[PDB]
Amino acid sequence: MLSGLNHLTLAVSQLAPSVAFYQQLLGMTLHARWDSGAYLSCGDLWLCLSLDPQRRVTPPEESDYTHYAFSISEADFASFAARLEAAGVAVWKLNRSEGASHYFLDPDGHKLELHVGSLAQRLAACREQPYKGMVFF
Amino acid sequence: MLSGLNHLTLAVSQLAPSVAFYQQLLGMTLHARWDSGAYLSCGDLWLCLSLDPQRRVTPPEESDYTHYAFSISEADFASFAARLEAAGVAVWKLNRSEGASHYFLDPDGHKLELHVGSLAQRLAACREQPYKGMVFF
Ligand SMILES: C[C@H](O)c1ccc([N+](=O)[O-])cc1
Ligand SMILES: [Mn+2]
Numbered sequence: 001m002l003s004g005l006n007h008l009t010l011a012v013s014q015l016a017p018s019v020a021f022y023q024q025l026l027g028m029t030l031h032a033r034w035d036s037g038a039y040l041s042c043g044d045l046w047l048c049l050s051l052d053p054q055r056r057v058t059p060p061e062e063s064d065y066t067h068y069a070f071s072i073s074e075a076d077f078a079s080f081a082a083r084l085e086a087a088g089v090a091v092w093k094l095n096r097s098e099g100a101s102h103y104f105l106d107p108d109g110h111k112l113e114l115h116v117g118s119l120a121q122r123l124a125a126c127r128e129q130p131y132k133g134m135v136f137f
Numbered sequence: 138m139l140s141g142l143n144h145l146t147l148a149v150s151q152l153a154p155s156v157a158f159y160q161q162l163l164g165m166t167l168h169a170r171w172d173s174g175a176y177l178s179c180g181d182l183w184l185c186l187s188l189d190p191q192r193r194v195t196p197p198e199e200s201d202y203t204h205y206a207f208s209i210s211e212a213d214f215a216s217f218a219a220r221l222e223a224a225g226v227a228v229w230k231l232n233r234s235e236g237a238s239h240y241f242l243d244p245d246g247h248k249l250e251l252h253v254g255s256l257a258q259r260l261a262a263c264r265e266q267p268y269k270g271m272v273f274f
């Protein structure tokens with residue numbers, strides 16, 4: 001059967017600024033780069049950045065809610081979010097509707113998130129403060 | 138420090154066919170559903186489906202190469218691909234890289250992939266036959 005996410009591939013319009021964002025600013029590990037892409041890891045996540053002439057720099061009001069959240073500990077969350085803010089990283093959401101989260105954009109407008117907590121923790125939180133119509137299986 | 142992918146959220150235009158696709162066709166575990174979304178898991182992956190009236194059913198020629206690959210074993214690959222084919226799921230790309238891959242579309246045009254093989258396997262293949270301009274770190 002399917003066993004998890006093998007990799008996340010993000011199309012990018014300019015390879016070098018995107019590598020710098022994920023490696024230098026977000027601290028991911030860069031394993032290789034080539035003329036049209038790069039391979040990084042973030043813990044067990046395999047991230048591929050793929051140079052794509054079709055990728056457009058997309059304002060957050062023009063894209064849907066599809067987004068990619070990265071795990072961070074409770075101890076590191078606030079200072080990492082504040083560092084992104086001080087570095088001028090654009091945002092896209094302010095209301096914490098799914099717990100402790102910081103919502104920010106990559107150079108092409110990919111919607112990213114820092115989040116503290118697991119699915120199990122979110123389900124437990126939702127039992128106390130459920131979303132409208134929520135059912136648990 | 139970021140420790141992994143916390144969750145993947147896909148905006149969907151119609152919640153019921155998306156739940157059917159991810160839970161029933163793709164075999165993911167449904168943990169909760171509410172009026173405007175659902176939480177599923179696939180191995181370690183926390184997947185959120187978020188009902189979004191801004192999501193367009195998007196032909197693959199009109200979206201960039203951003204895509205989401207799920208892990209499957211080599212032994213299970215061919216029968217899972219055949220299941221998707223029987224269900225009429227559209228393919229958006231043929232495989233031309235190392236490791237088995239099946240490139241398929243979700244009901245809204247999200248670009249998905251079944252892939253066999255790890256980052257370590259890919260890096261090993263690349264060291265033997267580097268892409269144009271490839272540098273390792
Ligand atoms: C911008 C310049 O071409 C360049 C800088 C750095 C790398 N690298 O670390 O592999 C590649 C290419
Ligand atoms: Mn999220």
Ligand SMILES: [Mn+2]
Nearest residue numbers: 009204206250
């Ligand atoms: Mn891929």
